[PDB]
Amino acid sequence: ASLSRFVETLVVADDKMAAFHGAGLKRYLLTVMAAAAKAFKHPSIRNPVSLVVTRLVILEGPQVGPSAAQTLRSFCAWQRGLNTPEDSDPDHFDTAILFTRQDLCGVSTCDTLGMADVGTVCDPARSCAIVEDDGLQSAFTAAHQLGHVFNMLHDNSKPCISLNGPLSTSRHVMAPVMAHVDPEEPWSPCSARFITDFLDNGYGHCLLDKPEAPLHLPVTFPGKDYDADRQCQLTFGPDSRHCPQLPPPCAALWCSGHLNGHAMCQTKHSPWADGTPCGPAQACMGGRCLH
Ligand SMILES: CC(C)C(=O)c1ccc(OCc2ccc(-c3ccc(S(=O)(=O)N[C@@H](C(=O)O)C(C)C)cc3)cc2)cc1
Ligand SMILES: [Ca+2]
Ligand SMILES: [Ca+2]
Ligand SMILES: [Ca+2]
Ligand SMILES: [Zn+2]
C-alpha cells in the first residue's frame, strides 16, 4: 500500500512582494500554493502527495539579490532559524519556499525563474526553494522547484531520455525551460520514477505525519480569483489591462503596456489561468477554451 504523504510548508514572501501586492498578498500566495498543490495531486506523479501550507511569513531576514545561487543559500540558512527540533511540534515544517518580485538571475542570463537543490525534502537544513514571482505562472515555477526538492531531474537529462522514451516532447513540469504542460499528464514517467524511488528509499520519512492545522487553501479556479485584467496587472503592473485578442483564446495572455506615449501589447507567452472566462459558458483549461 502506497502511504499518503504531507509536505508541511513554510511560505515566505519578501520586501518586494509586499510592495507590489500590498494588501492582496496573503490571498495571492494561497491562490498560487493552491495551484502548486494541485499539480502534485495528479495521478501522473504516481504517488499521494499533499502540499500543505502550515506557516506563512511576510517580511529582517534573507539577503535577496540578483544572484539566484546566492539568494537560495541565504534563505536556506535563514529559514533554519524558524524551524524546530522535532516534527511532533505543530510549528515544524518540512520544506521552505521564498517568493520574491526580485528579478532572479542565473550565471549566464536573467531568464532564470527559480532555484532549488535536488533531493532535500527531509533535510531541514537543505529543504529549500526560491521563486521569482512574475504572476500566477509562479505556481508552475513552484511545482517545478519542489520537483527538484523531491529529487527529480530535468526531462532532457541523460537518465530521463531513457525513461521518457524517444518520442517525449517538452510538455511536462520538469522541462528545462518554461513549457505548456499537458493537463492530462503534467509529470513525465521520469519524474514519477525519481520521486517513487526517492520515497521508497526512505528519503521522505519526514512526510508521514498529518499536519496540525493547515492554512486554508482556496478551492476556486485561479482564473476566477483573478480575471484577465488582474492577471495582466499581476505580471506587468497595475496599469496593465488585457489586450483584446483575435481568436486563439486561452493559449497566450497578451497585456497592455506603454512605450513612447502610446499603447502596445506585451506577453510572457504564458496561458490564461485555469478557469478564466473565454466566452458565454466557456473557461480556459490548460490553454484551451473549453465548455
Ligand atoms: C495546470 C497544471 C498541469 C499545473 O499546475 C502546472 C504545473 C507546472 C507547470 O509548469 C511547468 C514548468 C514550470 C517551470 C519550469 C522552469 C524552467 C526553468 C527554470 S530556471 O530557473 O531557468 N532553471 C533553474 C531550475 O532548473 O530550476 C536553474 C537555474 C537552477 C525554472 C523553472 C519548467 C516547467 C505548468 C502547469
Ligand atoms: Ca508536523
Ligand atoms: Ca529572472
Ligand atoms: Ca512532517
Ligand atoms: Zn529546473
The secondary structure of the chain, three-state, reads CCCCEEEEEEEEECHHHHHHHHHHHHHHHHHHHHHHHHHCCCHHHCCCEEEEEEEEEECCCCCCCCEHHHHHHHHHHHHCCCCCCCCCCCCCCCEEEEEECCCCECCCCCCCCEECCCCCCCCCCCCEEEEECCCCCHHHHHHHHHHHHCCCCCCCCHHHHHHHCCCCCCCCCCCCCCCCCCCCCCCCHHHHHHHHHHHHCCCCHHHCCCCCCCCCCCCCCHHHHCCHHHHHHHHHCCCCCECCCCCCCCCCCCEEEEECCEEEEECCCCCCCCCCEEECCEEEECCEEEC
Probe target for ligand 1 pocket from 154, 181, 191, with the most ligand atoms within 8 Å of CB: 181
C-alpha cell at 149: 526538492
Q: How was this structure determined?
A: X-ray
Breaks (C-N over 2.5 A) in the chain follow: 59
Overall resolution, Å: 2.8
Q: Which ligand is nearest to the CA of 88?
A: 2
φ and ψ at 144, to 5 degrees? -65, -45
Instruction: Determine which helix (DSSP H) or strand (DSSP E) holds 231, and give its type and residue range.
Output: helix 228-236
Binding site membership of 179 for ligand 1 (Cβ less than 6 Å): yes
Contacts of 6 (CB under 8 A, 6+ apart): 50, 52, 94, 207, 208, 209, 210, 211
Name the CATH superfamily, with its identifier, for domain 1-217: Collagenase (Catalytic Domain) (3.40.390.10)
Assign domain 218-291 to its CATH architecture: 3-Layer(aba) Sandwich (3.40)
Whole-number Å distance, alpha carbon 183 to ligand 2 midpoint, is 31
Contacts of 165 (CB under 8 A, 6+ apart): 189
Whole-number Å distance, alpha carbon 66 to ligand 3 midpoint, is 8
φ and ψ at 118, to 5 degrees? -90, 125
Q: Three-state SS for 181? A: coil
Show me where the domains of the chain are located.
1-217, 218-291
